[PDB]
Amino acid sequence: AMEANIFCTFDHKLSIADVGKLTKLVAAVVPIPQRLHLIKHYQLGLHQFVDHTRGYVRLRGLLRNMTLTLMRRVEGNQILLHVPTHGLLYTVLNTGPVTWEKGDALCVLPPLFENLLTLGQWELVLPWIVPMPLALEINQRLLIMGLFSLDRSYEEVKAAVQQLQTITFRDATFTIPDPVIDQHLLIDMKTACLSMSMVANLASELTMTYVRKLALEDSSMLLVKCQELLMRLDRERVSPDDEIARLSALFVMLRQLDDLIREQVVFTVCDVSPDNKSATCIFKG
Amino acid sequence: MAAMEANIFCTFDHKLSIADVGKLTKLVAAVVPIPQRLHLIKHYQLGLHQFVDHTRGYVRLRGLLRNMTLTLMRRVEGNQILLHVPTHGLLYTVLNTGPVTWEKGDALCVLPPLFHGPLARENLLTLGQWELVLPWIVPMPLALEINQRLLIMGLFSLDRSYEEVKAAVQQLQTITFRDATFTIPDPVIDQHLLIDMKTACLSMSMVANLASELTMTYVRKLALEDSSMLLVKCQELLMRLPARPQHVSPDDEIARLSALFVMLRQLDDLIREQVVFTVCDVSPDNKSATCIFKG
Amino acid sequence: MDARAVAKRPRDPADEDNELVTALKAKREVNTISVRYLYHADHQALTARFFVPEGLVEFEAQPGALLIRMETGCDSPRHLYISLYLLGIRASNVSASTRCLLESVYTASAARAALQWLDLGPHLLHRRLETLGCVKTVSLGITSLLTCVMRGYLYNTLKTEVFALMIPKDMYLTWEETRGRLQYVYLIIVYDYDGPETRPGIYVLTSSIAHWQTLVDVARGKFARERCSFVNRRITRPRQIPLCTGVIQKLGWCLADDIHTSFLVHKELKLSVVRLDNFSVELGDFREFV
Amino acid sequence: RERSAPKPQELLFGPRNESGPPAEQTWYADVVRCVRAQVDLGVEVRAAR
Amino acid sequence: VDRWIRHAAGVERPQLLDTETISMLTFGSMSERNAAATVHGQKAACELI
């Protein structure tokens, strides 16, 4: 009795040793760009997406748009991928650098680092599977290091960047890559950081008028305390068309940051072997 | 005792003509909402027409539609229609009701219908001062822009005079999306939108307060020695008026920026609809697509 | 491919042989094992197995309860599996009599360590906890075995009887007077910021509302005092970073007619609970509202 | 009231947290009204923080 | 005085992560290293009263 499967044909020849190398990934996760039936090997993995100017957050967005798949037995001249369906359970290989415990929640992240088999113009790379708190921590730290990119010259910033760069978890102490190269920012990181800083900046000078107008009416009465908090912040430190453009800019800038704001809860885990590389989990949308 | 039905039959009781059942057959594989679930229901409860009222506030209709349940249409036959409730994660086929073009790989949302062009297509089973008004299935950017423009218009209604509000409303009433254009019907300001205004302004002031010195100063610092069209537009939007950073504290900074992250999420959820559908490859005529039901 | 094969009715696990039967038929061999009918073959519910110390098992000796995973940063066992009933001893939304009863019943050594770990860290309960659905068997000992469902209809092995889920009475909350035949049940945590401690409240909420925006609207409507407390602490005490006056998690769908009120007995002590028999578990993650 | 915070040892084993004082205090009060010159002198009242 | 006694006695000053480890240790943890070599079997614990 067959089931729904995706067929993949390696266009380049595969030696026996290469097939034996690949078979060790029996049940690893592999992303595919589109839900075809007979896909070519160039589409597998995240290699075709990597670029020299585009950054990590672009990979995160593309992976969110990506379709997640699971592997099946490799055999003569063909390899089979099984696309999961919600609320069934599956086996996954913990390619990530973090061990798992029962009841952990997992999400998929683009990679940051044996190596996997390569071809003449091709390499095979798979995304990370990480528990949600560490995913939040790593995204927060990488974004905040994007902020310090501008001030890097001073030694305080270098020490702070080094301290932020290290991450600690259950018996895991790896280091994440510095999001700056040659004292310059990759353009997607620049857009994300600028969007967050702008949506922070716009709210400081826009809210006061609308808040003070609404203060007359609130029966829930906390909006007046909000007004007082904004006035205390002020103590700490126009034509309608410009106003409407500014509101539109605020909301479009917020939507630009939505690429990083929400997390796909891909997997929840069932008990794991001492072979801990391998674990079982239930797929969630 | 009770059992939750999954197959729903709808029976008409008006003496339909041949053209009515003919137009019903055209509607196969569309999506229709129901307020309550039973094995056999009357046509009066099916469709969105039951909710329309003379005030015609669009925000009211959106809020009402959010609570409703969604179903698909299957096996249309004489005066008896079968509606199948979708199960989360399964693969379904759907025929789009509205004129909005779809694209593969994106997400879709449910919205009440819009004023488009001459307003020609209302032929949907107009009978006995009742009609089958279907909801629209539209891609994510158009729905987000609609919610954004309603909320922005509501905010602008305050602190402004009547004629300025009229000009702004007449501008915001329009939308452009993928070579198409649409107009929002009856976007009148109402107390339903006032609740959204209150929560959105509270969240916005919170994100203003939680922002740290470095986050605020980043844009102004970068304008010093960088230059691009994006940067010049962003600077033009902002008001116009090196040094070692005043304070450095990655721990306090990361806590602050996490709180600001939560506040930004809360502000964003105001305009994000429930992501009903994720789409697969679509027929090139744009009429029907294969999708997965989520949420 | 052929027309008859395409038109043929789908395969029937209902009467076709199980795999072991096929193999033993193939070799014509018989073991002493009653190999024909496999238990749990038709089970749709996804099951997990958990080990727990002996102290916590009380009130789980009666089948049906929420099983929660709590975190502890120590090198030695990083997670401890706790029950919703014990978690009430920390909430400020429990009457004095019920809290005293729970404090008396759970006085085993292991339980108090979990209570220390819950409030010995700076972080609130929201970041510390995660939900595992409903527990349905006991096997007692110095270490006891629990089995638990994470996407399920809640039943005994032979499905001879449905297993209910019990919620303590003080935590149970309703926001509508009339109930539609379908309604969802959620886990609710709210925080009081006016007191010196960040004092948490624990709630379980049944509602006919499935859409997040309207549910959060009603929640902010009812929890207005707690929201005002959050704003008050934010304005009053700078350099402090509070967050999320309340959090929501979705956990269940149930047919509203099923709800009953019942008493629960253990150690010949009597507890008051609310009961949902024909229950099912659907699990989402935590989410924040302000 | 003049007691050190219990060590983790005492909290883990033996007696439970020893009961503290209740918020509900008892007061006795006099109230005087000036609009009509008359006084009340033997009042008993509940108090809380 | 503690430094002198621990230095002369031959036992290292104990250090444990944060406060929460003391509750974990009280719950139970094996917390001293195995000896380099064992020609004889287990170190028979002597208690001195």
UniProtKB/Swiss-Prot annotation, chain B:
One Pfam assignment: Herpes_V23
Assembly notes: Interacts with TRX1 and major capisd protein/MCP.
Keywords of the record: Capsid protein, Host nucleus, Virion
GO MF: structural molecule activity
Protein name in the entry: Triplex capsid protein 2
Main subcellular localisation: virion
Family annotation (InterPro entries): Herpes_capsid_2
Family the UniProt entry places it in: Belongs to the herpesviridae TRX2 protein family.
Protein origin, superkingdom: Viruses
Keyword check for Acetylation: no
Function: Structural component of the T=16 icosahedral capsid. The capsid is composed of pentamers and hexamers of major capsid protein/MCP, which are linked together by heterotrimers called triplexes. These triplexes are formed by a single molecule of triplex protein 1/TRX1 and two copies of triplex protein 2/TRX2. Additionally, TRX1 is required for efficient transport of TRX2 to the nucleus, which is the site of capsid assembly.
HAMAP family the UniProt entry points to: HSV_TRX2 (MF_04019)
Origin organism lineage: Viruses, Duplodnaviria, Heunggongvirae, Peploviricota, Herviviricetes
This protein's GO CC annotations: host cell nucleus; viral capsid
Subcellular location: Virion; Host nucleus
Curated annotation (Swiss-Prot), chain C:
Primary residence: virion
Subunit structure, as described in the record: Interacts with TRX2, MCP and capsid vertex component 2/CVC2.
Organism name: Human cytomegalovirus (strain AD169)
Family: Belongs to the herpesviridae TRX1 protein family.
Stored Pfam families: Herpes_VP19C (PF03327)
Superkingdom per UniProt: Viruses
Cellular compartment(s): Virion; Host nucleus
This protein's UniProt keywords: Capsid protein, Host nucleus, Virion
Protein function: Structural component of the T=16 icosahedral capsid. The capsid is composed of pentamers and hexamers of major capsid protein/MCP, which are linked together by heterotrimers called triplexes. These triplexes are formed by a single molecule of triplex protein 1/TRX1 and two copies of triplex protein 2/TRX2. Additionally, TRX1 is required for efficient transport of TRX2 to the nucleus, which is the site of capsid assembly.
GO biological process, one term: viral capsid assembly
Lineage of source species: Viruses, Duplodnaviria, Heunggongvirae, Peploviricota, Herviviricetes
Name the UniProt record assigns to this protein: Triplex capsid protein 1
GO molecular function: DNA binding
GO cellular component terms listed in the entry, alphabetical order: host cell nucleus; viral capsid
Curated annotation (Swiss-Prot), chain D:
Localization, UniProt: Virion; Host nucleus
Designated name of the protein: Capsid vertex component 1
Top-level lineage group: Viruses
Transmembrane spans: none
Coiled coil: none
Quaternary structure, from the entry: Interacts (via C-terminus) with capsid vertex component 2/CVC2.
Disulphide connectivity of cysteines: none
Function: Capsid vertex-specific component that plays a role during viral DNA encapsidation, assuring correct genome cleavage and presumably stabilizing capsids that contain full-length viral genomes.
Region (Disordered): 1-22
The encoding gene: CVC1
Part of the whole protein covered: 447 to 495 of 594
Family as reported in the entry's similarity comment: Belongs to the herpesviridae CVC1 protein family.
UniProtKB/Swiss-Prot annotation, chain E:
Subcellular localization: Virion; Host nucleus
Disulfide bonds: none
Source domain of life: Viruses
Subunit-structure text: Homomultimer. Makes the hexons and eleven out of twelve pentons. Interacts with triplex proteins 1/TRX1 and 2/TRX2; adjacent capsomers are linked together in groups of three by triplexes, heterotrimeric complexes composed of one molecule of TRX1 and two molecules of TRX2. Interacts with scaffold protein; this interaction allows efficient MCP transport to the host nucleus. Interacts with capsid vertex component 2/CVC2. Interacts with the small capsomere-interacting protein/SCP.
Free-text function comment from the UniProt entry: Self-assembles to form an icosahedral capsid with a T=16 symmetry, about 200 nm in diameter, and consisting of 150 hexons and 12 pentons (total of 162 capsomers). Hexons form the edges and faces of the capsid and are each composed of six MCP molecules. In contrast, one penton is found at each of the 12 vertices. Eleven of the pentons are MCP pentamers, while the last vertex is occupied by the portal complex.
Homology family: Belongs to the herpesviridae major capsid protein family.
Name of the featured protein: Major capsid protein
Protein source organism: Human cytomegalovirus (strain AD169)
Region of the whole protein represented: 1127 to 1175 of 1370
